[PDB]
Amino acid sequence: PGIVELPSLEDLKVQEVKVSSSVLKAAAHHYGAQCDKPNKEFMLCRWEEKDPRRCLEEGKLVNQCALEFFRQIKRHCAEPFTEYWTCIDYSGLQLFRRCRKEQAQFDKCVLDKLGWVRPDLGELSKVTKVKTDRPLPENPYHSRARPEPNPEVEGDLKPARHGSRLFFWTM
Amino acid sequence: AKTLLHQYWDIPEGTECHRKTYAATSIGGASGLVVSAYSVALKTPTSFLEGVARTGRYTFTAAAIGAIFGLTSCISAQVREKPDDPLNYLIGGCAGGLTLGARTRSYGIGAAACAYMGLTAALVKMGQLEGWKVFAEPKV
Amino acid sequence: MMTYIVFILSIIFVMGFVGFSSKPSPIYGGLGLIVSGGVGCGIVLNFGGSFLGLMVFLIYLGGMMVVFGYTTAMATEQYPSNKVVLGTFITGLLMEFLMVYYVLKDKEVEIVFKFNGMGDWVIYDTGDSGFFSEEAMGIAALYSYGTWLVIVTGWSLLIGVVVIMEITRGN
Amino acid sequence: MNLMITLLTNFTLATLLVTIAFWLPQPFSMKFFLVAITFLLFDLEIALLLPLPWASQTTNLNTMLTMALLLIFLLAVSLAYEWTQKGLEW
Amino acid sequence: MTGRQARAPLQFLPDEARSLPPPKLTDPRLAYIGFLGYCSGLIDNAIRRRPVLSAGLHRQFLYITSFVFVGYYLLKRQDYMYAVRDHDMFSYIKSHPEDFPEKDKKTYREVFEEFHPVR
Amino acid sequence: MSLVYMNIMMAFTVSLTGLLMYRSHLMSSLLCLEGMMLSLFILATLMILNSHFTLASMMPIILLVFAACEAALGLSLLVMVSNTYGTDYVQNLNLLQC
Amino acid sequence: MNPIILIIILMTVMLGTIIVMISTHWLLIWIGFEMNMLAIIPIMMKKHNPRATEASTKYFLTQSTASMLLMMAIIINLMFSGQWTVMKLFNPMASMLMTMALAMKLGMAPFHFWVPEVTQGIPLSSGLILLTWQKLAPMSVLYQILPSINLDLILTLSILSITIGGWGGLNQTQLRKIMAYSSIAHMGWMTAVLLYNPTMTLLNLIIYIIMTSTMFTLFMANSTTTTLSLSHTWNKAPIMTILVLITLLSMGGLPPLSGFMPKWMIIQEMTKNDSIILPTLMAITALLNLYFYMRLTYSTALTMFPSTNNMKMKWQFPTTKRMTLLPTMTVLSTMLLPLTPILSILE
Amino acid sequence: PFFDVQKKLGVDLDHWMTIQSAEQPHRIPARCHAFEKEWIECAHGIGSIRAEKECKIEFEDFRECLLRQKTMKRLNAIKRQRDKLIKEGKYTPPPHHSG
Fold first, then answer.
1. Which residues cross the membrane (chain C)?
2. Which residues of A touch E87 (CB under 8 A)?
C-alpha cells in the first residue's frame, strides 16, 4: 500500500565521530557535563515521535557537539588523557575502578586548567526537564477513529412482562 | 469430503449424465475406505492378505451401491422427465438395497435394505429440494 | 559450517524423533531422546538461548532420561533388527527427504500453511541495547509479579510427592 | 560454533584414542525406584529454585523473600513428609 | 443469552435488584418447595428403618426451613433475571426504529385468503 | 514465517505418531510423550524469543516442569504395572475387556 | 490410605477444578487439568486389585495425551495472534485440535474407549468422583471458547456420542458400564447445544450431576455389580426399589418427572433455529437409551427374581450404611418439574 | 462456567502474565508494542463481533508485525529475481559493498 519516505543522501552526510570505543567510554562523564545539554532535544524528539528519519537534524547536532567537545579536549590539557584511556583500554570490559589514580590526574588537569567538575553520583540520572522549539506531536500511532461505542444500558427496570413468557408456569 | 459431495450435488438432476455415476462411485470408494479402515484397525486380520481382502470387499460393495444408485437415478430422471420428485430416488435406494443384499447373498437383508435405503434417499433428495441446512443455522 | 546451521540442526532433530518413534528397545529410545535433546539445545542456543536451553539440559538430559534409563534397566528385559521398526525409520527418512527437497528446490511447502522457504537469519534483533540478556531478567521475575504461579507450581509438585508415595504404598 | 569446534576436536581426538587402542593389539525392588523418583521431584524443585540469584535485584524484595522461603519451606515439608512416613526406610 | 455486564463481577443479587417487587409470603412456588422439604424429611425417615411421621420432627422442621430459605433467595434472583431481560428487550426496541416497521392493520374487509372446502 | 517452525511442527507430528502407534513397550510410548513435550518447549521458546515476548517468558520452563512431573507419575505407574506382572508389555493387559 | 491424605486429595481435586474455573491464562487451565489427573489417580487404586491398576494405567495414558494435545493447540494459538487471554481463538486448526483434546478429556464417541474400562475395575466412590469432576472440568472451558469453533466438530461428536451411548449399552449387565454408556449419551446431549445457548448445557450439567449422584448413592447403599444383586436388594428392602424405579425413570426422561426438563428445553432452543431433523434424530436416540434403563427396572423392582437365604440372616440387622446425602439429592433430582423457570437462575 | 473472583476480590493476581505491554520488570518493550496498543484501543469497548468485522485492518497489521509473512515473501521474491538475473549476467552486481 503506502511507501516509506526515506531521507536523502544529502542529510546522510555528517562528519561522523570515527573514534574508538574505550576512549569514548572513558570520556563519558565530562561529556555529560559540558555537552549533552542540547541532545535531550534529540531524546525528547525520539520519545515523542517513534520515528527516526525525522529527528536527524538533532542527531547532526549531537554529532557536532561531541566532535566539538573532543576537539576542545584535544587542543588543551590533557595529552595524558591518552595515557588514561590506554591505561583503561586493555583491562577486559572497562571497569572504571581500574585506573583510578590517573583518573584523579585527569580530573586535576581538567579542573585546575579548564574547569568541568565531574558529575558526582548519581547526577547522570534524576529526570530532567527539557524545552524545545517544535510543538509536541499528536497521535503518532497513525490509526483510524474508535469505530463504535456500545449504547450503555441504563434506566430503572420494569418488572417482568406477563411472567416468564414460556409455554406455561405463568406468573 | 465437501469437494466431491459438492461435485455430486452441483450437477443439475436433470441429465448431465455418467458424471453422476462417476461421482457416486467416488463417494462409494471413499465411504468403503472409511469403514474398512475402522474394521482393519479393530480386527487384526493376520494375515495381512485377509486385511486387504476385507478392505477391498467393503470398498467394492459401497462403490457398487453408489454406482447402481447413480445409474437408476440417471435412467429414472431421463425417462420420467420430472426432476423434482423423490420417487425416482426411492427407486434408487431400493435398487441399492437390493444389490447390497445381492452382494452379501441373503435376501431378507436385501429387503430391509431396500426399504430403509429407499426412505433415506427419498428424504435426502426431498430435503435438498426444500432446503434443509447441513448441521446448523448456526445463528439464532 | 555456513548460514543454514539452524535448519541443519533441525534436520538432525527430526531425524532423532523418527529414530526413537520407530519403537526400538527403550534404552535405544532413551539414546534417541538424549541425542534429540542435545540438538534441540543446539537449536535454541542458536537463537540464544543463553539460559533456557542450558536449563532444559539439566532437567531432561540431567534428571528425566536418567530415570527413564533407570526404569528401562530395572523393569523390562528385552533380551534377544526387525522389519517394522527399521521400515518405519526408512519411511520417516523418506518423508523428511521429500519435504526438505521440496523446501530446497521450490518456493514453499504447505501442509495447510505457507512456510516461506529459506534459512532463518530473519528475523532477529537489529543490535539493540540489551545489556541484561532479556531471558535473564524475564525469568528474574516470578518473585515480584509471580505470586500465584510459583505457588500453584510448588503445590502441584508437593501433591505429586504424596501421590507417588501413596501409589507406591502410602504410607 | 567455537565451542562446537572444541567439542569436535575433543570428540575426534577421543575417537582416535579409542580406535588406535583397538586396531593395535589384534528382578528389582521398589526401594531401587523410590530414590530415583525422589531425586526427580526434588530436582524439579531445584529447577524452580535456581533462578533465585537472577532475581535478587528488583523493587519487590520482601515478596521475593516470602515466596523464596515458601518454595524452600514446601520442599522441606515434602522432605519431612517422606521422612516421617517411612518413605526412606530399610 | 450472555452477561451483559460481567465487568462488574458475579454479584448473586445486584444492588439494582432492590427495586423489583419481592416474592411475597406464602407464594405457591415456595409452598411447593416446603412440600418438597416435608417429603424430603419423610423419605429421610424412610431410608433407614426409623418410623415415618414420627421421631424426626426436628429434622422435618429443619428441612422445611432450609429449603424454603434457599427457594426464597432463588425466587428473588429469578425475578431479577426476567426483569433485566425485559428491560434489555425494550431498550433494543427503542434503540433502532429502522428495522422493526409498524405493520399497518389490514382489516378483514380487504384481506384475501382462499377457501379450500372440506366436503 | 521463520521457516524452522515448519520443521518443528513436522517433528511434533513425528513424536505424536510415535506416541500413538507403539508396538511392545510402554516405556517407548512414555519417552515419545517426553519427546512431544520437548517439541512444544522448543517451538514456544523460539516464538517467545523472536517475539521479544519478554514479560511472560515463563512458558518454556513452567510447561517443562509440569509435564516433567507428569512423566514422573508415568514412571511410577509403569513401575507398579511391572511390579504386579512380569513384564510391561502392551499385551498381558487384555484383561478387563470392554 | 490415611483420612488426612484423602482430605488432602479432595482438596487438590477441588483446587484443580477451581483453577480451571477461575483462571484467565492458558497455562493455568493446563495446570488445572493436569493437577486434576494427578490427584484423581490415587482415588482409583483405592484397593490393590490389579483391575484398578490397569484401569488407572489406561486412564493416565489417555488423559496425559489429551493434556499434551491441548498444550499443542495453545502453542498453535500463540504461533498465530499471540496472547494468553481465554477468548475467541485465531485458527480453525487450533480450535479443531483443542476441541478434540477436550473431547478426549471428557467422554466422546471416537474417544470413549477408556470410559467403561476405567469404570469397571474401580469401586463406586472413584467412579462417582471421576464422572462428576471429569465431566465438570472441560465444560467451563468449552463454555468459554465456544465463539471460534467450527460447528461440525461439536455437532458430529455430539450426534455420534449420543448414538454410541445408545447402541453400546444394550449388552452390559455390569452396572458401571451401564452408567458409563449413559454418561457418554448425556455428554453428547450436553455438548450438542454449546453453540446455540450454553445456559441449556450448564443446566443439563447440573441435572446430570445430581442424577448420577443419586444413582451412585443408591448403589453405594448396598454394594452391587449385577442386576441379580439388585433383586436381592428388592428382597431385603422395599424403599430402595421405588428409589431405583424413580431414579431410573428420571434417567429415562419422562414428562411427569424431572429428567425430561433438560431434553425439552434443548429441543425448544434448538428448534427456534432451522434445526428440526437433528432434534427428532436426537430425541429418537433418547428414546433408544431408555431401553436398558427399562430392562434394569424390570430386573429390579417390578418383576422379582428368586432369592437366596441368608437374606433371612440379613433381616436381623437393620441398615447401617451412611449415605452422604441421598434423599435431598433424590427429591431435588426428581420432583423438580414445575421449577422450569429456574432456567434463568443460571446466567 | 467462568467465574470472576479475579475481579471480585480486587487482587489482579493473574492479569500480568497475560499480554505484552504490561509493565516488564525493567521498562522495556516487546517487538510489536505500539501495534498492540492501537489494536487493544481499537477493540476495547466492543462486543467481540464488530471486533471481527471492524478492526480487521489494524489486526492484519499486528499479525504481519508478529510473523512478518508477506514481507518475507517480498524479500524472497527479490532474492529469487536477483539469483536469476545474476544467472543471466546483466550488471555483475554493485549491490555489495562497492560499485
1. 1-21, 25-45, 47-67, 84-104, 145-165
2. 153, 155, 157-158
